[PDB]
Amino acid sequence: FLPFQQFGRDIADTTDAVRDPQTLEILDITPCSFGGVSVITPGTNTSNQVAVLYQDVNCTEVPVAIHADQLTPTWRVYSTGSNVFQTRAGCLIGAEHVNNSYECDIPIGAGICASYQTSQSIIAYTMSLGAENSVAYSNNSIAIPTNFTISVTTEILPVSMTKTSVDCTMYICGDSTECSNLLLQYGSFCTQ
Amino acid sequence: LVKQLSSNFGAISSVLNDILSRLCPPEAEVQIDRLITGRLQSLQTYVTQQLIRAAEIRASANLAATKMSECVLGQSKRVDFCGKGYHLMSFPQSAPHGVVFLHVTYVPAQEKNFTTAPAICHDGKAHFPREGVFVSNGTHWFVTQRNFYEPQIITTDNTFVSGNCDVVIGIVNNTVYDP
Amino acid sequence: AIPTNFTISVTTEILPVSMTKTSVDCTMYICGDSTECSNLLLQYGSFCTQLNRALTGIAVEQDKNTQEVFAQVKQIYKTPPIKDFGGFNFSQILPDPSKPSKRSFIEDLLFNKVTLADAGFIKQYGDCLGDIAARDLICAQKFNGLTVLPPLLTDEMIAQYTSALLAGTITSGWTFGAGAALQIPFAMQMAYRFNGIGVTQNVLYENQKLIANQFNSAIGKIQDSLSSTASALGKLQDVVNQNAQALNTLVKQLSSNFGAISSVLNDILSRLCPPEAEVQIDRLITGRLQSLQTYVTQQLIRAAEIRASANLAATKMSECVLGQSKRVDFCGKGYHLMSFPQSAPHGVVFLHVTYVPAQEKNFTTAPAICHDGKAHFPREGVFVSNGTHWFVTQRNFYEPQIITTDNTFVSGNCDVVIGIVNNTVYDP
Numbered sequence: 001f002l003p004f005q006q007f008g009r010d011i012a013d014t015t016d017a018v019r020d021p022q023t024l025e026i027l028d029i030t031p032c033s034f035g036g037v038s039v040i041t042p043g044t045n046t047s048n049q050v051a052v053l054y055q056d057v058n059c060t061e062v063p064v065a066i067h068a069d070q071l072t073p074t075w076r077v078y079s080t081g082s083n084v085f086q087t088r089a090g091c092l093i094g095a096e097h098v099n100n101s102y103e104c105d106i107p108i109g110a111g112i113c114a115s116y117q118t119s120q121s122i123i124a125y126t127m128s129l130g131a132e133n134s135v136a137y138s139n140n141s142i143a144i145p146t147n148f149t150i151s152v153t154t155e156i157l158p159v160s161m162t163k164t165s166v167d168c169t170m171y172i173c174g175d176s177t178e179c180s181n182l183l184l185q186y187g188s189f190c191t192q
Numbered sequence: 193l194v195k196q197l198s199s200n201f202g203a204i205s206s207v208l209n210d211i212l213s214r215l216c217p218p219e220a221e222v223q224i225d226r227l228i229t230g231r232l233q234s235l236q237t238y239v240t241q242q243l244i245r246a247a248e249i250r251a252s253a254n255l256a257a258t259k260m261s262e263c264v265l266g267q268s269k270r271v272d273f274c275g276k277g278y279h280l281m282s283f284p285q286s287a288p289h290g291v292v293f294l295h296v297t298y299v300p301a302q303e304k305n306f307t308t309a310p311a312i313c314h315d316g317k318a319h320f321p322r323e324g325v326f327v328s329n330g331t332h333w334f335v336t337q338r339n340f341y342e343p344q345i346i347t348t349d350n351t352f353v354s355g356n357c358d359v360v361i362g363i364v365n366n367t368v369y370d371p
Numbered sequence: 372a373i374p375t376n377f378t379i380s381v382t383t384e385i386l387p388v389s390m391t392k393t394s395v396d397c398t399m400y401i402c403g404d405s406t407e408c409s410n411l412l413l414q415y416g417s418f419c420t421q422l423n424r425a426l427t428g429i430a431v432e433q434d435k436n437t438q439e440v441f442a443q444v445k446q447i448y449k450t451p452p453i454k455d456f457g458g459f460n461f462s463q464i465l466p467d468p469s470k471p472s473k474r475s476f477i478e479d480l481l482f483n484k485v486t487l488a489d490a491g492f493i494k495q496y497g498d499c500l501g502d503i504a505a506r507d508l509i510c511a512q513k514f515n516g517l518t519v520l521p522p523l524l525t526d527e528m529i530a531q532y533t534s535a536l537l538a539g540t541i542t543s544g545w546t547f548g549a550g551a552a553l554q555i556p557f558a559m560q561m562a563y564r565f566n567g568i569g570v571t572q573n574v575l576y577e578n579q580k581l582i583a584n585q586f587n588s589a590i591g592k593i594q595d596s597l598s599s600t601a602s603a604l605g606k607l608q609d610v611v612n613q614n615a616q617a618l619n620t621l622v623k624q625l626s627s628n629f630g631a632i633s634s635v636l637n638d639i640l641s642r643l644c645p646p647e648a649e650v651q652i653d654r655l656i657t658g659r660l661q662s663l664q665t666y667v668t669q670q671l672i673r674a675a676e677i678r679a680s681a682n683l684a685a686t687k688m689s690e691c692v693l694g695q696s697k698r699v700d701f702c703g704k705g706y707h708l709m710s711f712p713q714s715a716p717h718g719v720v721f722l723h724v725t726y727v728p729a730q731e732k733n734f735t736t737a738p739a740i741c742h743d744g745k746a747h748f749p750r751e752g753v754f755v756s757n758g759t760h761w762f763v764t765q766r767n768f769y770e771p772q773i774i775t776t777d778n779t780f781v782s783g784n785c786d787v788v789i790g791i792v793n794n795t796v797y798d799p
């Protein structure tokens with residue numbers, strides 16, 4: 001900091017750092033609630049168990065990043081535990097990691113999907129792309145069908161929507177002449 | 193949208209009549225302007241979202257009309273345009289704010305490995321299948337359509353000759369029965 | 372004018388498929404962990420839930436776009452150990468096992484040419500707190516509630532999908548798109564394809580090596596072209612840039628006063644007290660909420676764009692990779708033969724390989740031939756003369772034959788048609 005400069009600011013013109021008046025050292029300020037939190041859950045009416053993803057954090061440093069010492073106990077159980085799993089997306093807590101690959105049920109990210117399974121609990125895994133298959137290619141081999149089938153598939157396409165219509169005067173003012181008179185100053189918003 | 197009528201938008205109240213019964217023009221109009229701009233903002237947002245969704249639905253409807261034209265009124269050569277498989281037909285059925293197509297398709301079901309070769313040499317000249325491919329069960333060479341096993345005896349009316357059998361790769365020695 | 376020689380050309384078609392799955396926390400961006408500002412914000416209601424719902428729909432839509440583009444086959448095929456393809460070299464497009472990931476050589480070039488200005492998909496807390504000397508843009512976004520979720524499908528897995536598609540296309544032709552994947556020698560897939568564009572297969576076998584060499588040479592030129600010119604991938608780069616640009620503008624809009632005394636909430640709150648402070652706070656809130664609404668609207672427009680592009684890309688994959696497209700200039704200029712997919716950040720690339728007539732000669736023609744008063748029309752091809760003899764030949768390649776009854780058909784007599792000429796039909 002230059003001698004005449006007291007505050008520093010970032011791109012957003014929010015104060016980024018402060019020079020402490022008493023001890024001339026510079027301190028950066030960072031928000032308390034850094035880090036998104038996403039809840040993975042089966043739908044209610046089935047179970048109330050859930051798992052939590054903390055995005056772009058190390059599972060060693062999840063508690064300090066989330067300020068786990070300050071939360072309530074029911075968040076602290078999900079702050080750290082035995083079901084901690086690291087993924088390219090972040091740290092997942094509350095779901096046991098499974099080696100077996102399955103089709104995606106609830107997507108988390110970075111190839112990771114979870115589901116609810118009965119071991120009655122939530123599981124997280126790397127999705128299965130489909131059955132691994134190999135092809136018996138050769139320069140003098142053909143594979144010819146001898147029987148067939150006729151299949152029927154359903155293709156659903158939306159075509160239209162509800163033909164909504166709106167009267168400005170009722171929604172905005174509600175049959176009040178004075179409010180409509182003030183509204184007329186705005187002009188052709190409502191005709192538009 | 194209706195829930196957004198409950199918003200104060202920084203006003204003392206969300207109700208117009210409360211403001212008007214409590215406040216008088218010189219400073220009432222400010223709160224009324226705040227409510228008006230908030231509600232007009234909500235309406236503008238709603239209309240914008242509806243326009244986006246309408247562009248979506250018009251794209252879907254154009255696609256549906258295209259499917260109707262190319263699969264109901266005809267047979268579509270486009271792969272996976274009207275369902276997985278070699279398209280045969282499609283049947284329309286109505287639905288609230290939408291349509292449903294029963295796409296009926298051909299799918300090969302059972303298959304066998306066989307041995308093949310592009311061409312056949314008869315007397316030095318190379319014979320190529322007019323349609324289908326050459327195939328062998330290990331003893332006899334036949335011609336068959338690609339998508340269904342149906343061998344036939346090789347004849348001059350099943351094949352055509354172009355060049356000789358010293359150029360093509362994979363040709364094999366056999367005989368062409370001459371009716 | 373009939374062609375006598377041809378060429379096999381390879382063209383590159385780049386299509387954006389997805390965007391960055393952005394997400395926004397209103398409370399951080401607008402208020403910044405200040406409870407009083409959040410309390411004032413609650414008076415506005417469900418604006419922010421609406422925005423979050425819209426962006427969640429965007430993210431789900433991008434994942435769906437990628438899935439429906441690439442995951443059109445439910446079996447993960449793999450190339451055989453033996454790369455016997457009748458002289459056709461498939462080594463710059465297949466995965467390289469020696470390489471850690473399964474990206475191809477060409478895919479490696481593509482990923483190394485376009486630059487993804489996001490510091491990767493990992494940026495830890497400590498990474499930002501150690502990067503206090505540069506004030507990284509991504510950290511500034513992250514501290515203001517702006518986050519970039521990772522895509523569901525990682526590049527490993529997109530590459531696996533493309534490898535499976537290539538294996539099916541190369542070993543099974545179009546059969547793997549139609550139900551089960553069969554096996555076909557590649558030259559016979561070529562024969563079918565040439566039959567598809569009205570070309571007799573026999574020509575290819577008669578020149579097979581040459582064609583393969585041409586194809587291989589073409590592939591090399593692609594590798595030479597892509598490795599130098601950066602603008603080739605602009606269609607994708609701009610997308611990234613645009614998204615980045617948007618975010619930058621958004622954070623810069625936190626500097627705006629919007630007519631307030633200051634852009635900082637805490638300054639107003641430390642200087643002013645509710646009865647007139649709330650007015651300035653309302654001004655800031657409406658300005659920032661306006662900026663967010665604008666950003667979300669632009670993202671929705673761009674998402675409609677990208678969904679259109681992704682539907683087009685899926686259509687190309689279905690109609691040109693899983694089959695041969697009769698649509699003209701749908702999969703590159705020329706009579707379509709095939710297309711090969713390659714992944715790319717937030718997009719896909721199609722190597723469309725096509726037939727183009729190359730050398731041609733003038734000849735004299737006529738619709739029909741009179742033999743004994745009856746008119747003969749070509750069953751296929753056209754009548755042509757070199758000045759001495761009349762032949763029949765396919766339209767798109769010079770290959771004359773002697774006229775015979777099995778090459779033509781008779782309908783009517785030669786007194787009606789215009790342009791018929793006198794000649795003889797040899798009778799075997």
Ligand SMILES: *[C@@H]1O[C@H](CO)[C@@H](O[C@@H]2O[C@H](CO)[C@@H](O)[C@H](O)[C@H]2NC(C)=O)[C@H](O)[C@H]1NC(C)=O
Pocket residue numbers: 146147148149301302
């Ligand atoms: C070809 O495959 C079809 C099935 O895809 C066979 O149809 C079934 O044949 C069995 C044995 O003859 C019957 O028990 C079933 O009832 C048939 N299916 C139906 C729906 O009736 C067909 O027979 C096969 N043809 C050959 C020559 O193998």
Ligand SMILES: *[C@@H]1O[C@H](CO)[C@@H](O[C@@H]2O[C@H](CO)[C@@H](O)[C@H](O)[C@H]2NC(C)=O)[C@H](O)[C@H]1NC(C)=O
Pocket residue numbers: 313364365
């Ligand atoms: C197919 O038949 C031709 C005709 O007999 C074979 O050509 C002969 O090949 C032998 C191989 O040693 C030569 O010695 C002869 O001079 C060839 N004669 C002619 C007229 O070409 C050919 O080898 C046979 N190919 C297969 C795969 O059976």
Ligand SMILES: *[C@@H]1O[C@H](CO)[C@@H](O[C@@H]2O[C@H](CO)[C@@H](O)[C@H](O)[C@H]2NC(C)=O)[C@H](O)[C@H]1NC(C)=O
Pocket residue numbers: 375376377378581584585729730
């Ligand atoms: C048809 O045209 C192709 C080029 O489009 C010719 O291929 C080239 O032929 C010349 C002369 O024989 C060679 O020097 C080149 O090396 C060939 N090209 C490649 C890539 O190898 C082909 O020869 C022509 N055919 C005829 C009958 O004229």
Ligand SMILES: *[C@@H]1O[C@H](CO)[C@@H](O[C@@H]2O[C@H](CO)[C@@H](O)[C@H](O)[C@H]2NC(C)=O)[C@H](O)[C@H]1NC(C)=O
Pocket residue numbers: 454460461462
């Ligand atoms: C396919 O083309 C390549 C040329 O790129 C052939 O040669 C390989 O080239 C790469 C890179 O130039 C080298 O790393 C390899 O060592 C080369 N291989 C050999 C055997 O020298 C390659 O051989 C071609 N494929 C086939 C099957 O012939």
Ligand SMILES: *[C@@H]1O[C@H](CO)[C@@H](O[C@@H]2O[C@H](CO)[C@@H](O)[C@H](O)[C@H]2NC(C)=O)[C@H](O)[C@H]1NC(C)=O
Pocket residue numbers: 741792793
């Ligand atoms: C093609 O051949 C027919 C058959 O010889 C020609 O028809 C004759 O044309 C001459 C022209 O003066 C007439 O005098 C004859 O009466 C025609 N005979 C018949 C049987 O049609 C015809 O002119 C020839 N056309 C060409 C272009 O050579």
Ligand SMILES: *[C@@H]1O[C@H](CO)[C@@H](O)[C@H](O)[C@H]1NC(C)=O
Pocket residue numbers: 045046
């Ligand atoms: C929800 O619960 C009711 C009764 O408990 C049951 O009838 C219904 O099937 C449930 N729905 C789902 C989706 O599980």
Ligand SMILES: *[C@@H]1O[C@H](CO)[C@@H](O)[C@H](O)[C@H]1NC(C)=O
Pocket residue numbers: 058060493
């Ligand atoms: C922090 O994360 C990196 C990778 O993101 C990992 O290698 C490292 O082990 C983590 N920290 C600790 C203490 O394990």
Ligand SMILES: *[C@@H]1O[C@H](CO)[C@@H](O)[C@H](O)[C@H]1NC(C)=O
Pocket residue numbers: 136303304305
């Ligand atoms: C074809 O051959 C491959 C490899 O030899 C084998 O796995 C497959 O089962 C065979 N299919 C039939 C129908 O014989």
Ligand SMILES: *[C@@H]1O[C@H](CO)[C@@H](O)[C@H](O)[C@H]1NC(C)=O
Pocket residue numbers: 329330331332
């Ligand atoms: C091959 O087909 C011929 C046709 O007559 C038949 O005689 C022969 O038994 C068949 N062989 C096998 C192994 O199917």
Ligand SMILES: *[C@@H]1O[C@H](CO)[C@@H](O)[C@H](O)[C@H]1NC(C)=O
Pocket residue numbers: 139140361362363455
């Ligand atoms: C097909 O491949 C085998 C080895 O896999 C080889 O011996 C044979 O010669 C090839 N076919 C032709 C026509 O060369």
Ligand SMILES: *[C@@H]1O[C@H](CO)[C@@H](O)[C@H](O)[C@H]1NC(C)=O
Pocket residue numbers: 731732733
């Ligand atoms: C065909 O004729 C036109 C005009 O006579 C001439 O310009 C052109 O070069 C000719 N092409 C060939 C291949 O002879």
Ligand SMILES: *[C@@H]1O[C@H](CO)[C@@H](O)[C@H](O)[C@H]1NC(C)=O
Pocket residue numbers: 757758759760
């Ligand atoms: C036309 O083709 C015939 C076919 O045998 C040939 O004899 C004649 O020389 C050719 N004439 C010209 C000008 O190419």
Ligand SMILES: *[C@@H]1O[C@H](CO)[C@@H](O)[C@H](O)[C@H]1NC(C)=O
Pocket residue numbers: 789790791
């Ligand atoms: C073609 O045009 C020429 C003049 O350009 C004319 O003499 C000739 O008659 C025409 N062809 C026919 C079949 O009439």
